[PDB]
Design a protein around this ligand. Structure first.
Ligand SMILES: CCCCCCCCCCCCCCCCCC(=O)OC[C@H](COP(=O)([O-])OCC(O)COP(=O)([O-])OC[C@@H](COC(=O)CCCCCCCCCCCCCCCCC)OC(=O)CCCCCCCCCCCCCCCCC)OC(=O)CCCCCCCCCCCCCCCCC
Ligand SMILES: CCCCCCCCCCCCCCCCCC(=O)OC[C@H](COP(=O)([O-])OCC(O)COP(=O)([O-])OC[C@@H](COC(=O)CCCCCCCCCCCCCCCCC)OC(=O)CCCCCCCCCCCCCCCCC)OC(=O)CCCCCCCCCCCCCCCCC
Ligand SMILES: COC1=C(OC)C(=O)C(C/C=C(\C)CC/C=C(/C)CC/C=C(/C)CC/C=C(/C)CC/C=C(/C)CC/C=C(/C)CC/C=C(/C)CC/C=C(/C)CC/C=C(\C)CCC=C(C)C)=C(C)C1=O
Ligand SMILES: CCCCCCCCCCCCCCCCCC(=O)OC[C@H](COP(=O)([O-])OCC[N+](C)(C)C)OC(=O)CCCCCCCCCCCCCCCCC
Ligand SMILES: CCCCCCCCCCCCCCCCCC(=O)OC[C@H](COP(=O)([O-])OCC[N+](C)(C)C)OC(=O)CCCCCCCCCCCCCCCCC
Ligand SMILES: CCCCCCCCCCCCCCCCCC(=O)OC[C@H](COP(=O)([O-])OCC[N+](C)(C)C)OC(=O)CCCCCCCCCCCCCCCCC
Ligand SMILES: CCCCCCCCCCCCCCCCCC(=O)OC[C@H](COP(=O)([O-])OCC[N+](C)(C)C)OC(=O)CCCCCCCCCCCCCCCCC
Ligand SMILES: CCCCCCCCCCCCCCCCCC(=O)OC[C@H](COP(=O)(O)OCCN)OC(=O)CCCCCCCCCCCCCCCCC
Ligand SMILES: CCCCCCCCCCCCCCCCCC(=O)OC[C@H](COP(=O)(O)OCCN)OC(=O)CCCCCCCCCCCCCCCCC
Ligand code: SF4
Ligand code: SF4
Ligand code: SF4
Lengths: 115, 155, 96, 70, 56, 176, 318, 360
């Protein structure tokens, strides 16, 4: 109940501030005022055109490494077990394989952005 | 009384606007160098609440510091148009006032006031950093005497 | 003045609260400094007007006026030459 | 001078002090002058819901000592 | 130049220099704003004889 | 004679390699950059309290224009038009005619202060010290038209700032 | 009395953010041999009040090419989520006492990124788009390093509860046993808050204003308020993580004063840094955290899993 | 964000200076030159004055040549402070801008105390200078110069060894020595690639052959070596200023030929020949013999010259201005190959571009 009421208050305050912003001030809207900004000259093309990602390979690798935090975050609880020898072995094995993945991509020029 | 209240509200918004002037980061020619020295430590325009911001959509003041040419004139009008109101224009230097040294050129606009409205004209070539700061404090006094709400109250 | 302050901050003026009928408690202006003190305040000289007064002339303004732009006292440009071509005035009596 | 920056830090510091102080004092006011009971695990929640029943007034922060056994 | 001895030590240490020796703010070591009048010299052509213009 | 700015070979002894290793791992040369900005925080700022304090100027300062008089009140300008001929911006327009007493005087003396480049060539060329650039620089206006000075406005400027103008010419005329 | 507690949190936060803008302008001013705001109010104390009123009585514009629903959703999301990251912070008593508070802040910090991506995309402007995709690169850069740096520290605390970090540092700050981790954590909060030298989503001198180039008036203020509420929060987090404060249950105010001072000093270091260094290229930020911090963080993560086991110093689960 | 092509569009500050000069006298055309490279005002005046004096076949007096070198090197400090700190401002480092622009403010007072204008002095003219230094100025220049070296040290403490600054500038915008010559580069753009060239030493003008200074030379041809060259040139300018403050000779400050330089006002009001020459030199101007010259100086931004054509009258026939930034900016497309958007921001600042001179 408390958490939900705390969230409602934060996003209600955020919403009411936006509402005041649009209804309190005096507005004078015309075409040139709302045109897209490109430093003074009309944009040459649409902003919705394709935008090449030079770090696409590193972005895919982020998906795989971002799943290691899910597997690594239980470690504080894992250290409470009575099977410490097994737990410590698999904790280090899992982190090491995460490191070998980094080493492979680094050495194979995978972290270098495409020209 | 209603006239008293609108007078005090007018003094509040007028105060807020003149105490938080945000010039657009917009300079054209030598006059922009003297505008840099007004931001330099000796004069420190930031202490008056005057802060440069690059986006025209977050600016309250346009300082036309330098020469305005026919090629650049459409760009100036565009960035002026993209300024949310209330917006004030300060014309700095002979070139931006009436063409200055290049009044009779095929490629120069004889005054920025042919392209945009102008609130304060700062003379000089260039005006000293302390002369531009006089124009900014003269603009603030102009905003201090606005009667937007009082004029509304008796429409 | 305070000569222990660094150059630029060693001279200053506390503006009057009234000048030429205008309330200046809050609305001070750089143009309110009369010319004789304008030279000392800007470090164009070391001697103040009280130690070395300006030369007296009967045409010098006795009353200093600050920047009048935006007021009814502002300056309006106009041509100071007289008319150049004089038009013919027809007779006021019918010829018939 | 630099110490003219302090007034802006003092106001900022006072604003950062209020949230912690207000929560600490509001908890005392809402739990009979004690810390709010922390229940991170079911055992602690089980004891808090037992305190409600024992209190006889449906409040878990109303303690009952040896005066309530006889 | 009005800094206390402690603040002078702190700022000298934080930068590694002796700042007080070379202050970037000017003080009474500048020239007087009133100066004695000059008497500038004249050029080589200020002569009353042997100074015809067709020779220079 | 020339010098190299970035032609140096780093030492390779174990103590120099470790020193660079400590710099890489402990950010020593970045901590040193912090120490320089900390020093400025404890210096007196260079800001002046405008308009209660003014930036220093000199007697040669080229500010607002003014037309001067002789000590008797007669105008110094005698409509020679040297200022109009030398003005780089053609900001000066002059007309003249014999005055009612037969004196060579002007009927129009306009300076378009929006064409002017405040160069001082006019006061250099004036043979009677009539047109000068004064010490005033705080004369911004709310309209363009107020910057088209005519003769009446220029004589008013001269009569207003004469006390200061005369003292500045007295301080600099031997350099001229 | 809970609603009063919420208001006694967000309202003081919005006031501290307002005067942090003043404090930054004056601290930047004196490190630049000038003063900063000193005219509007005594010593500039009314400058934030003048700026707030000015922005909220100014005209807001929706660009003709914008996607309105997302264009207006983004500023609401930014400020709504910047205030939501304070509710689990123990000062010393959290408003919301969470058993996984460290996880909660991680989750909210990843959701607050979309207030940048949707802001920049919805504006339908090239500079807003370039700014938005710099936030994708920035998040890819620090997210893995940030999470594993937290994990290494939590292996000495033993729980994800923020209030437990108070008990862990009852004898000594964690800056001593984990100074290498504190260095990387501090840099990762600079990247995570889009602060100089990692202010790339805005990048004034490159993208004019970046992801919020098209925003005006109140909507812009919400992004600015969210930005400054995050840096205070990320430094309160740092003070709790590495500069623990003693908690006397009979003097809960002494904790707050001491804890508030450290947070102010860490926040001042953000302004100190912004005045001292240039800006990384955003591809150089990726290589900083993948080729330097990640190899070290992985090694330190293994070290802190083994060190408690080999010294018999595993912290309690509860 | 990779830059595939740079297409600079200029002319947004094209004002027709070269066409307007054709309607002015040689004196009326001088203030135009303060407004081309409006960070190097007195250096632009000197290049124009050297060209007119060359066509006039006259020589400025020795004391004027020392003032022109002295204020030529104060101006180089003004330009390099503007170039380095704005270059650093665009890269994210904003603090140095404020420290050094309090040093530019003090050097503007030297401008203001010799001419009356902070920037557009119009002080250096064909024949010498306009007025003698006021008493006490050289003492104030000595005091400013005595401390300026520390100001540069503080600038270097922030940038030179900073690893973030080196990342933004090392191996960015590499230009080969062969390409630099063919693309028309000059100044630090040549010296950064290792070319040993400087007009102050190879083709000296005024009294630059009577002073001692070292020309910095780069090794990599990148933005970092050109930053080191500019910071080291500021140090050498202080070295020259010390020698100009001690070797300053006495004498007149403009050529003692009243058909070129106007007479003193005291003589103009007492002598018939002096009033006639004052009258003609301010209405018609001095006729310049027919002929065309190309005269160049080592301006702060590179080789600045004018191809001045005279037809025998008092007004120039043609005045072509060679702005060093015009050639540098033309090379922005070659130097940006293989770089990102943020690197082009660094390349623009390393070229030291001001569009008053590029566009004229
Ligand atoms: C953190 C702790 C900060 C301590 C307070 C600052 C201080 O007292 O510095 C004194 C002193 C002044 O340093 P300074 O830079 O050399 O001052 C230049 C002149 O000497 C002295 O400069 P001055 O000639 O201008 O002296 C006159 C000035 C001096 O005024 C002062 O007394 C300094 C401000 C202290 C209050 O008078 C004022 O202007 C007073 C009005 C301004 C007060 C603004 C600060 C008010 C406190 C804000 C928090 C309120 C809650 O600094 C020290 O000696 C060391 C301070 C650190 C140790 C303090 C604790 C032991
Ligand atoms: C988490 C919460 C997510 C909120 C929903 C997603 C945002 C809306 C959206 O993306 O629509 C895009 C899409 C594009 O419409 P558009 O924005 O008009 O296109 C822009 C054009 O430029 C059109 O330009 P324009 O010139 O027509 O714009 C003028 C308009 C512009 O004024 C507005 O944009 C309205 C203001 C929107 C406020 C959005 C913030 C919501 C409150 C804050 C909540 C924060 C989280 C807590 O001003 C007006 O005149 C207002 C009256 C006309 C109605 C405007 C259209 C309202 C659509 C409903 C929006 C909700 O809208 C739709 O097609 C409506 C379909 C229904 C969408 C909702 C269902 C999506 C499925 C996922 C949600 C699952 C259910 C969870 C929500 C239910 C919870 C109980
Ligand atoms: C020489 O050759 C040439 C160039 O080459 C350099 C050129 O360039 C140009 C072109 C010139 C120009 C475009 C203009 C140049 C002018 C200058 C002044 C630039 C010179 C250098 C500078 C360093 C100037 C200023 C720049 C910086 C980076 C200084 C840093 C200091 C600042 C104060 C900037 C902003 C800093 C901070 C900390 C934030 C302040 C910002 C705000 C918007 C204020 C606070 C914000 C709010 C949203 C309000 C707060 C409160 C809220 C929101 C409400 C909360 C409370 C509630 C109750 C809700 C020309 C012609 C040229 O010839
Ligand atoms: C405000 C109150 C005043 C005090 C505030 C603290 C100021 C601290 C910053 C200024 C430091 C002074 C500058 C300085 O001496 O640095 C140069 C010095 C020397 O710079 P150096 O780059 O020339 O290195 C010289 C020695 N070699 C080359 C061999 C490495 O830098 C240092 O030694 C700093 C080392 C500290 C490292 C700390 C990093 C780890 C932090 C752990 C968490 C804490
Ligand atoms: C005391 C009881 C009480 O106040 O009512 C709560 C009441 C009663 O208190 P209670 O039920 O929450 O707690 C019990 C109190 N004792 C311990 C005494 C039994 O709680 C509610 O019923 C819900 C309250 C709804 C919201 C109340 C209004 C909040 C808005 C107040 C506006 C002013 C805020 C000022 C913020 C200033 C910011 C700087
Ligand atoms: C945008 C507007 C929404 C804001 C984002 C909200 C995201 C979900 C919030 C999850 C809260 C949480 O993690 O629990 C914390 C904690 C979990 O950490 P915990 O381990 O301390 O659990 C607490 C319980 N004890 C004491 C037993 C340990 O849970 C709570 O604080 C109370 C649970 C209340 C559950 C109510 C959830 C309903 C709201 C879900 C909204 C989902 C829509 C999100 C859409 C986002 C995309 C726009
Ligand atoms: C170089 C740039 C990066 C700088 C980042 C670091 C900047 C912030 C560093 C904060 C250092 C501590 C600030 C001291 C002032 C706060 C006083 C205080 O907290 O109480 C006294 C504190 C003691 O209070 P305590 O609550 O912290 O207790 C000490 C720690 N335990 C709990 C383990 C006992 O002592 C000091 O901080 C003296 C320093
Ligand atoms: C001058 C340089 C300034 C530098 C900047 C400093 C940053 C600001 C400092 C942090 C902000 C502190 C502001 C508040 C300090 C005083 C608060 C206080 O101690 O009050 C007494 C405290 C409880 O009081 P409190 O709960 O806050 O108010 C009553 C609410 N019913 O009960 C107690 O007695 C607790 C013990 C307090 C001991 C002190
Ligand atoms: C003495 C200080 C003790 C306290 C330091 C504690 C911090 C340790 C981390 C820093 C590394 C220092 C410790 C390494 C040994 C240093 C002492 C040493 O190497 O002997 C000195 C000797 C003199 O060097 P010199 O002959 O001039 O040239 C090198 C030629 N091989 O050099 C030699 O010639 C011997 C051979 C040198 C090569 C050995 C390999 C050194 C590099 C391996 C990595 C060391 C760091 C590993 C730890 C990383 C984590 C910090
Ligand atoms: S008014 Fe003067 S300083 Fe300003 S741009 Fe024109 S010529 Fe340059
Ligand atoms: S100062 Fe120069 S531009 Fe202005 S009126 Fe005099 S001669 Fe003309
Ligand atoms: S002001 Fe002087 S130069 Fe101009 S017309 Fe009058 S007398 Fe001649």
């Amino acid at each position: 109940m408390n958490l939900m009421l705390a969230l409602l208050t934060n996003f209600t305050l955020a919403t009411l501030l936006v509402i005041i912003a649009f209804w309190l001030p005096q507005l004078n809207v015309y075409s040139e005022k709302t045109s897209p900004y490109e430093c003074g000259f009309d944009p040459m093309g649409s902003a919705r055109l394709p935008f090449s990602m030079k770090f696409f390979l590193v972005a895919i690798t982020f998906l795989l490494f971002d799943l290691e935090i899910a597997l690594l975050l239980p470690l504080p609880w894992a250290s409470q077990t009575a099977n410490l020898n097994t737990m410590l072995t698999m904790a280090l094995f899992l982190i090491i394989l995460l490191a070998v993945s980094l080493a492979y991509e680094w050495t194979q020029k995978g972290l270098e952005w495409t020209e | 009384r209603g006239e008293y209240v609108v007078a005090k509200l007018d003094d509040l918004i007028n105060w807020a606007r003149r105490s938080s002037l945000w010039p657009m980061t917009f300079g054209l020619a030598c006059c922009a160098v003297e505008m840099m020295h007004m931001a330099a430590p000796r004069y420190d325009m930031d202490r008056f609440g005057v802060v440069f911001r690059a986006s025209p959509r977050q600016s309250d003041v346009m300082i036309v510091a330098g020469t305005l040419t026919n090629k650049m004139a459409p760009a100036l009008r565009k960035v002026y148009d993209q300024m949310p109101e209330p917006r004030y224009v300060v014309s700095m230097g002979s070139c931006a006032n009436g063409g200055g040294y290049y009044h009779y050129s095929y490629s120069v606009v004889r005054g920025c006031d042919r392209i945009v409205p102008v609130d304060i004209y700062v003379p000089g070539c260039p005006p000293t950093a302390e002369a531009l700061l006089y124009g900014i404090l003269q603009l603030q006094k102009k905003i201090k005497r606005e009667k937007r709400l009082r004029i509304w109250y008796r429409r | 003045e305070d000569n222990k302050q660094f150059f630029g901050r060693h001279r200053w003026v506390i503006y009057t609260t009234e000048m030429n009928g205008k309330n200046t408690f809050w609305d001070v202006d750089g143009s309110m400094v009369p010319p004789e003190w304008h030279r000392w305040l800007h470090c164009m000289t070391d001697d103040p007007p009280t130690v070395k007064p300006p030369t007296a002339r009967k045409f010098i303004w006795t009353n200093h006026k600050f920047n009048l732009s935006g007021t009814p006292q502002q300056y309006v440009p106009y041509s100071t030459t007289r008319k150049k071509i004089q038009e013919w005035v027809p007779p006021s009596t019918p010829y018939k | 001078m630099w110490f003219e920056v302090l007034p802006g830090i003092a106001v900022m510091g006072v604003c950062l002090f209020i949230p912690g102080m207000a929560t600490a004092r509001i908890h005392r006011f809402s739990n009979g002058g004690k810390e709010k009971r922390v229940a991170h695990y079911p055992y602690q929640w089980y004891l808090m819901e037992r305190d409600r029943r024992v209190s006889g007034v449906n409040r878990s922060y109303v303690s009952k000592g040896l005066e309530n056994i006889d | 130049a009005s800094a206390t001895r402690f603040i002078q030590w702190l700022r000298n240490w934080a930068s590694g220099r002796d700042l007080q020796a070379k202050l970037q703010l000017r003080y009474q070591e500048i020239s007087k704003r009133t100066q004695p009048p000059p008497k500038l010299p004249v050029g080589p052509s200020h002569k009353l004889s042997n100074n015809y213009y067709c020779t220079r | 004679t020339y010098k190299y700015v970035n032609l140096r070979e780093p030492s390779m002894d174990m103590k120099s390699v470790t020193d660079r290793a400590a710099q890489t791992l402990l950010w020593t040369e970045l901590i040193r950059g912090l120490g320089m900005t900390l020093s400025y925080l404890f210096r007196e700022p260079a800001t002046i309290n405008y308009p209660f304090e003014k930036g220093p100027l000199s007697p040669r300062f080229r500010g607002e224009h003014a037309l001067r008089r002789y000590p008797s009140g007669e105008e110094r300008c005698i409509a020679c038009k040297l200022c109009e001929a030398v003005c780089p911006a053609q900001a000066i327009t002059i007309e003249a005619e014999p005055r009612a007493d037969g004196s060579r005087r002007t009927t129009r003396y306009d300076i378009d202060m929006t064409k002017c480049i405040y160069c001082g060539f006019c006061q250099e060329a004036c043979p009677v010290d009539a047109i000068v650039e004064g010490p005033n620089f705080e004369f911004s206006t709310e309209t363009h038209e107020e910057l088209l000075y005519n003769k009446e406005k220029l004589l008013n400027n001269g009569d207003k700032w004469e006390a200061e103008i005369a003292a500045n010419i007295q301080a600099d005329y031997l350099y001229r | 009395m809970f609603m009063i507690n919420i208001l006694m949190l967000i309202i003081p936060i919005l006031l501290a953010v307002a005067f942090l803008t003043l404090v930054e302008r004056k601290v930047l001013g004196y490190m630049q041999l000038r003063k900063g705001p000193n005219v509007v109010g005594p010593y500039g104390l009314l400058q934030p009040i003048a700026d707030a009123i000015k922005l909220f009585i100014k005209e807001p514009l929706r660009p003709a090419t914008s996607s309105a629903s997302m264009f207006i959703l983004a500023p609401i999301m930014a400020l709504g989520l910047a205030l939501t990251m304070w509710i689990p912070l123990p000062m010393p008593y959290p408003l919301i006492n969470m058993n996984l508070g460290v996880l909660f802040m991680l989750a909210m910090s990843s959701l607050a990124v979309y207030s940048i991506l949707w802001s920049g995309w919805a504006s339908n402007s090239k500079y807003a788009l370039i700014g938005a995709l710099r936030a994708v690169a920035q998040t890819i850069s620090y997210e893995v390093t940030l999470a594993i740096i937290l994990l290494s520290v939590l292996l000495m605390s033993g729980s994800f509860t923020l209030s437990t970090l108070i008990t862990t540092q009852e004898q000594m700050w964690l800056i001593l046993p984990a100074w290498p981790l504190a260095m990387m954590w501090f840099i990762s909060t600079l990247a995570e808050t889009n602060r100089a030298p990692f202010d790339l989503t805005e990048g004034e001198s490159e993208l004019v204003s970046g992801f919020n180039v098209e925003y005006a008036a109140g909507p812009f203020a919400l992004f600015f308020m969210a930005e400054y509420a995050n840096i205070i929060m990320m430094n309160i987090f740092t003070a709790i993580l590495f500069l623990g404060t003693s908690h006397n249950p009979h003097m809960p105010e002494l904790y707050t004063i001491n804890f508030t001072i450290k947070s102010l000093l860490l926040t001042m270091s953000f302004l100190w840094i912004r005045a001292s260094y240039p800006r990384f290229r955003y591809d150089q930020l990726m290589h900083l955290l993948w080729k330097n911090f990640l190899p070290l963080t992985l090694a330190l993560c293994m070290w802190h899993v083994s060190l408690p086991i080999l010294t018999s110093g595993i912290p309690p689960q509860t | 964000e990779m830059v595939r092509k740079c297409d600079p569009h200029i002319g947004l500050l094209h004002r027709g200076t070269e066409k307007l000069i054709e309607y002015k006298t040689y004196l009326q055309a001088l203030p135009y030159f303060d407004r081309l490279d409006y960070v190097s005002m007195m250096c632009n005046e000197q290049a124009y004055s050297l060209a007119v004096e060359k066509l006039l076949n006259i020589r400025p007096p020795p004391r004027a040549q020392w003032i022109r070198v002295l204020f030529g090197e104060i101006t180089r400090l003004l330009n390099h402070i503007m170039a380095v700190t704005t270059h650093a401002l665009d890269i994210g480092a904003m603090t140095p801008f404020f420290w050094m622009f309090e040093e530019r403010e003090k050097m503007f007072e030297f401008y203001e105390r010799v001419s009356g204008a902070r920037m557009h002095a119009a002080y250096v003219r064909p024949g010498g200078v306009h007025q003698d230094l006021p008493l006490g100025l050289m003492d104030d220049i000595y005091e400013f110069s005595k401390n300026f070296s520390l100001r540069i040290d503080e600038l270097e403490e922030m940038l030179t060894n900073n690893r973030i600054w080196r990342n933004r500038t090392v191996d960015i915008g590499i230009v080969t020595a062969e390409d630099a010559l063919n693309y028309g580069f000059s100044g630090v753009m040549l010296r950064g690639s290792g070319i040993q060239w400087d007009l102050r030493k190879t083709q000296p003008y005024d009294v630059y052959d009577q002073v001692e200074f070292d020309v910095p030379i780069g090794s990599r041809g990148d933005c970092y070596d050109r930053y080191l060259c500019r910071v080291e040139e500021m140090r050498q300018s202080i070295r020259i200023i010390s020698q100009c403050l001690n070797k300053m000779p006495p004498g007149e400050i403009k050529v003692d030929d009243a058909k070129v330089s106007p007479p003193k006002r005291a003589e103009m009001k007492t002598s018939m020949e002096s009033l006639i020459h004052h009258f003609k030199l301010y209405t018609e101007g001095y006729q310049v013999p027919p002929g065309a010259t190309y005269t160049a100086i080592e301006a702060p931004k590179g080789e600045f010259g004018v191809y001045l054509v005279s037809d025998g009258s008092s007004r120039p026939y043609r005045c072509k201005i060679k702005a060093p930034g015009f050639a540098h900016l033309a090379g922005l497309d070659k130097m940006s190959k293989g770089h990102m958007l943020a690197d082009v921001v660094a390349i623009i600042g390393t070229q030291d571009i001001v569009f008053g001179e590029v566009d004229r």
